[PDB]
Structure formats: C-alpha cells, structure tokens
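User: I need a structural model of Hydroxyquinoline fluorescent protein from Saccharolobus solfataricus for a docking pre-check later this week. Nothing fancy, just the predicted structure tokens so I can convert them on my end. Input:
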Amino acid sequence: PRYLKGWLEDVVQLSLRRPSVRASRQRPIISLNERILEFNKRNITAIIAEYKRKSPSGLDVERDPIEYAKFMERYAVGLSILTEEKYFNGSYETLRKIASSVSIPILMADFIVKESQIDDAYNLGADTVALIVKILTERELESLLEYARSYGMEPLIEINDENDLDIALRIGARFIGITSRDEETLEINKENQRKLISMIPSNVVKVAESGISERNEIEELRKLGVNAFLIGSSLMRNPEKIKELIE
Ligand SMILES: [Mg+2]
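Assistant: Understood. Predicted structure tokens for Hydroxyquinoline fluorescent protein:
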C-alpha cells in the first residue's frame, strides 16, 4: 500500500493481516452499477444504504443488521456493509448474514490492500467491493481492479482529490465514488466534490458519498450528473428517512 500516517496507516496494517475466509458462494453476482443505471432510466432515486455501527466521525450505535437490511431492501438500490473491525465495528459474519438475507446488490466496504480480501468479499456473498485510491499505489489499484473483474465484479473506485481522479481515469475505472470526506482528516469539502464530479466522463457511473442527509442535496447532485448516493450515518440513526430521500 501507500505510505500513510495516523489511523489510516493503522487500518492498512491491520488489513494486511486480516485472516481470509472459506465458503462456497451460493448466488451469482448481481451488478450494483447496472442496477443504478436501471434506476436512472426509471427515474427512481438510487440510494446505496450503508450499514456501519461505528465510524471515525463518532457514530456509535447498535442496530440489528438483518432488520436494517430487510427494511432497506424495499427502498435502496444496494447496500454497503462495513467489514472493517477496529474503527467501524464491522465483521465478515455481518456481511455474510446480510448477503444471505436480501436479494439486492451488496458492496463490501473495507480497506482492501490484498487479493484475499476480494476473495473474502466473493466468498461471503458480496457483489462488489470498494477500492480506495488514496491507500493504494497505482500498480496495486490496477492489479486489484483486474482481479475483482476476474470474479465478475465491477468495483467502486473511491476518489477524494484531483490526483485520485487522474489515477482512477487512467486505470480505466467505470464506477467511481466521489467522497466529500478526506478519510485522513475527516474534513468535508462539498465544493471540491462537485468540481471532481464535473471532471468525470458521462459514461462513468458516479456515486456521491459522505455527509448526505437531505433530499435537496441529492436533487442538486443528480442535476450535476451523479447517478447514485451513498448514505450511511443518517440512515443508521433514522432508517425511515430513506423514504423521504427517494420521494
Ligand atoms: Mg464509500
């Protein structure tokens, strides 16, 4: 991975030693990006509901994962399940249980730095993964992207700055998440997010991530070309809010 500092350096070191899982996968992959495009053609707001019990920005809740997933199944275009353990209180069992309980596409969200973590996502029933430009070298990102596609997944390539965007387009990303949160510092910058969104080709499926709580922001971003919206904290604290956000 890249050389990092602070908590990101720690979580990458932890991820490098993550024990892999063994399991026979049951259901073919169903594509999250393709379902997003279908929602766009149907003019249905496409929200990826994220399940995470804890976060570095201070979320700390207990909520049953299956009841959350089954509720979101009716409304969300997909789910994003945190599997990182130390900072997000996620687990592989959580992903396995959710994936086996719903029929909508599932993204495994973690700090992926080795191929076995992609194996883990597949073997646990996820349909895709996030890959984070700012923790990986360009060579690693190219290699892990090809590896994920070899399973039939189209990973969400996460970007936060213009360097990240240059790498993401260079390596052939077709599904990009534009996060307004700098994961190192937790700083939110929506202006920079919008600038990056305006710089992405039309044919890349774009997901706006982080700090989203209100329908009017979703509406503004959709007008700018965003195809789907990753929403975690607001839904973890009031799940029913998704109904208003998709109205
Ligand atoms: Mg994300």
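Before docking, keep this in mind: The chain has eleven helices and eight strands.
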